Amino acid sequence: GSEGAATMATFEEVSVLGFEEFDKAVKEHESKTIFAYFSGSKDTEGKSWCPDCVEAEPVIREGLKHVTEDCVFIYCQVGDKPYWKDPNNDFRQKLKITAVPTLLKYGTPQKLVESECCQSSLVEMIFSED
Known part of the structure; x- marks a missing residue:
């Protein structure tokens, strides 16, 4: 397969579950976005x-x-349906999550909520701009 990447960005998919794992993967990619x-x-x-x-996964x-920078995606699973509601979760307590799915950009206050998670126009943006 003859491919070509003239200074093209790069992304890394990392599947995790819980805050513990999430932290590990994060610290590991703390050097990059x-x-x-x-x-x-x-x-x-x-x-x-x-x-x-x-419907947002693919979005x-x-x-x-589209991202123009080397980032590191991390699929963090909050838990179960009735578990996400738990207002006493480390996600809404420490991460202070608004509404899942919640796309937070480690480093910047820029985040995409459910609606913003299904909007490709926004997804390709939060990645394009810094």
Whole structure:
């Protein structure tokens, strides 16, 4: 396969579950841009109870390509459907998550919420601009 990348950006997909793992993967890619995608856990079929995370997955993964910087995506699974509601979760306590799926850009206050997670126009933006 003859491919070509004239100074093209690069992304790294990392699957994790919980805050512990998320932290590990983060610190590992602390040198480069990190992107945490807090979303519900996937079922046996490989889908998130939420109809958004399932429709945003491809919207965020595809956009990540438009990125002009070497970032490191991280699929962080909050947990179960009825678990995300838990207002006493380290996600809403420490990460102070608004509404999942929540795309936070480790380093900048720029984040894309459910709606912003399904909007390719925004996904390709948060990645393009710094």
